[PDB]
Write a protein that binds this ligand. Structure first.
Ligand SMILES: [Mg+2]
Ligand SMILES: [Mg+2]
Ligand SMILES: [Mg+2]
Lengths: 71, 115, 62, 154
RNA sequence: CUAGAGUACGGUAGAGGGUGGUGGAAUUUCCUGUGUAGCGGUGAAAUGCGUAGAUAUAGGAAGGAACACCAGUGGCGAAGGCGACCACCUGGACUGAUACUGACACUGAGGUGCGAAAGCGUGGGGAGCAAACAGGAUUAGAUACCCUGGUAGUCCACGCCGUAAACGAUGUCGACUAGCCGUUGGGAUCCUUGAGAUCUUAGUGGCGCAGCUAACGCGAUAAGUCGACCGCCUGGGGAGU
């Protein structure tokens, strides 16, 4: 039920407009290499999974998160 | 000439395997290939021949010392992990093992499909 | 990336960490270009093999 | 191919008191000529006792283990490429490989007095200069060129 | 007159368009160091590339196009189509409450538009890929498959052409007809902690009863029961000539 509670990581709270600033949240959703996790592993609702993917791609642009283990 | 804590580069295609011992500066010390060990064909692509060429690079590296190695594995082909087990057989302290793999995000388009 | 302690442990921590990350099946699909219709056959046949697997397992779950 | 094959046993050598020699005697017999082949094997046994002071069983015990090989090839074809695989010789099989190599090189020795042909074969293999020992070691060299095909498409 | 249809008001979701800008990984060409005998390719080889210092390996520069993971029977668009991030203009759909107009609707011969890709015209631009072509191999023979190279093209601006297995092989619109399991988005009611509950519309999937069907099979997203208008079919070749 670990994939069930992470659906409530955004829906149980009123944190609907997520930001690209809380890196302590976003590092839970990024794998060890750098690529972004699926949504059948976290089990988050697909409204927020689309909203989660934008905050990664903006934080990646501002060099707050890497791409690969190369750089 | 004396250098220590070198870096081992391993390049593994579908038909050949090239092993090179370098420094942190990226300078050649000893290179050894699967074709130079005398296989040349269907025997060339085997993971056994990636052990013969691996230790032979590990014998001209003791000219300069190099008691510590840092391994970068690169390539899709077989013998990708068999070459690492043929490194400390010569008696080398392997510190860490690291995948380096060229993966284009979109990249140029590859050649066409065989028939 | 795998650091190091015997040596056989760090091998199996590396053979598995590469596969659990990926970048080995993706390399194998870079050696022939698929036209986007043939990439719509993977999208078609794999969706059938997942929705039929949710029902054939229910026969085992009887 | 249901597995069927049971085991039949031949162990009889009263005039010397041996067991390996009786099985070796069967590889010399042609068309059931047992009494002919019995006096030739003893005929090439006493010439060794004439030659060497040691008991010639131990000469025969040493001459097996320098003709008997360890690994050998096995051409198992993948169905589109003809491969060969060096395989470990089973411990039961490796006796009969030497005894069958030994007799076939005795017949092309090209001497007179037939029991002297087999006499010279058992003398050489306690040293290594026999043609059976040279045929042994050459097939040993064929395995390491084949050693790349040991597990992979094997 | 307000049940069709349309307007005003909140509110969400989206690779829906157009105009600029900016990224990171990878490929190639070039420069420079180290280093020295092969690399590459294949059922196996050969053509090719190499000490006139290649592959490898490190540093640097230039340039071109595509946009991993998220990504899904998932979305949007009238259809073709549409995936990097941001600004910039800009169309329509959903959902709720409430007032207004009071039938203002449907379909549509002719006519008007938007039309994948290959191709055509003038100008740019040239990373990879690659018809035509060249060489090697296989082969009785091999223009072919396989291998090493390689040009128009693919890319951009402007204009043209109008066809495709342009496919759900199913014209648009409206009304009734047992169920069950999914899923996108949106309100509800509800005990409240929910991994909640049930109901209702707008989509998108898997089974299924009546019913229909030559059979296969569809089955509230009908090929079921019925209406309104349009297009089209009449044995095979000859011939969509
Ligand atoms: Mg059988
Ligand atoms: Mg279509
Ligand atoms: Mg049609």
């Amino acid at each position: 039920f670990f994939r069930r509670r992470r659906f409530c990581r955004f829906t149980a709270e009123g944190v609907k407009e997520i930001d690209y600033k809380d890196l302590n949240t976003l590092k839970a959703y990024v794998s060890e290499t750098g690529k972004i996790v699926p949504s059948r592993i976290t089990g988050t609702k697909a409204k927020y999974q689309r909203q989660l993917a934008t905050a990664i791609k903006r934080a990646r642009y501002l060099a707050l998160l890497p791409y690969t283990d190369s750089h | 000439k004396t250098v220590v804590d070198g870096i081992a580069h391993i390049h593994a295609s579908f038909n050949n395997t090239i092993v090179t011992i370098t420094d942190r500066q990226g300078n050649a010390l000893s290179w050894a290939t699967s074709g130079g060990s005398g296989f040349r064909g269907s025997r060339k692509s085997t993971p056994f021949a990636a052990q013969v060429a691996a230790e032979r690079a590990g014998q001209a590296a003791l000219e300069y010392g190099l008691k510590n190695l840092d391994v970068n594995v690169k390539g899709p082909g077989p013998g990708r992990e068999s070459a690492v087990r043929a490194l400390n057989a010569c008696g080398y302290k392997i510190a860490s093992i690291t995948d380096v793999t060229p993966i284009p995000h979109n990249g140029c388009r590859p050649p066409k499909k065989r028939r | 990336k795998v650091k190091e302690e015997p040596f056989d442990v760090a091998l199996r921590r590396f053979k598995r960490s590469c596969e659990k990350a990926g970048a080995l099946a993706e390399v194998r699909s870079r050696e022939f270009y698929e036209k986007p219709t043939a990439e719509r056959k993977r999208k078609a046949a794999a969706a059938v093999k997942r929705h039929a697997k949710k029902v054939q397992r229910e026969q085992r779950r009887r | 191919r249901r597995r069927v094959a049971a085991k039949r046993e031949v162990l009889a050598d009263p005039k010397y008191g041996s067991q390996i020699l009786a099985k070796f005697m069967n590889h010399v017999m042609e068309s059931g000529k047992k009494a002919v082949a019995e006096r030739i094997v003893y005929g090439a046994l006493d010439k060794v006792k004439e030659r060497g002071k040691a008991d010639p069983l131990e000469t025969f015990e040493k001459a097996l283990d320098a003709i008997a090989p360890l690994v050998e090839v096995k051409s198992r074809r993948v169905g589109g490429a003809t491969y060969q695989v060096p395989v470990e010789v089973r411990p039961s099989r490796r006796n009969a490989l030497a005894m069958r190599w030994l007799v076939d090189f005795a017949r092309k020795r090209g001497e007179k007095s037939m029991a002297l042909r087999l006499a010279g074969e058992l003398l050489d293999a306690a040293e290594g200069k026999g043609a059976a020992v040279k045929k042994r070691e050459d097939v040993h060299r064929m395995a390491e060129a084949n050693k790349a095909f040991s597990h992979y498409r094997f």
